[PDB]
A = this chain, B = another copy of it.
Amino acid sequence: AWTPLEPKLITRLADTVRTKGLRSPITMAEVEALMSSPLLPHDVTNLMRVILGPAPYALWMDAWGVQLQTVIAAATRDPRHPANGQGRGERTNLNRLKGLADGMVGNPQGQAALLRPGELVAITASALQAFREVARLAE
């Protein structure tokens, strides 16, 4: 069952990003805090939509896609990925990682249903690395 993040925590994090900036160690610590439980693509996408401005959000979408593509290359380079399965029918496509696959587009409940925990942690680590890249790039 999907539970959304508190809008109070999200508002506090947005104001933190607004006053301290993207690169301060306190901001990265707060992001790591709100990045503790494995989030669904819907959660991370809306979170970055709210806390980041338009141009940093575009940059972050780009960087997140690139990092997820590196993850999928490593996944096709190793059939023992915690997102993959043993047979070929469990291979994870980027539509399933970005939340674009069938039964997931716009629906967080179905998303949480079909996604694997390894998928969730890989998406989360990818999003964190992308946030780091964009923060280092913006300023």
Judged by DSSP, the binding face of A is helix
| Interface-side segment among A11-19, A82-90, A115-123, A131-139 | A11-19
From B11, B25, B49, A16 is in contact (CB under 8 Å) with: B11
Contact, CB under 8 Å: A8 / B4: no
- Does the CB pair A25–B7 fall under 8 Å? no
- Count the copies: 10
Contacts of A33 on B, CB cut-off 8 Å? 4, 6-8
Interface CB pairs A-B, < 8 A, 26: A4-B33, A4-B36, A6-B33, A7-B26, A7-B29, A7-B30, A7-B32, A7-B33, A7-B34, A8-B9, A8-B12, A8-B33, A10-B26, A10-B29, A11-B12, A11-B16, A11-B26, A11-B29, A11-B30, A14-B26, A25-B49, A25-B50, A26-B50, A29-B46, A29-B49, A29-B50
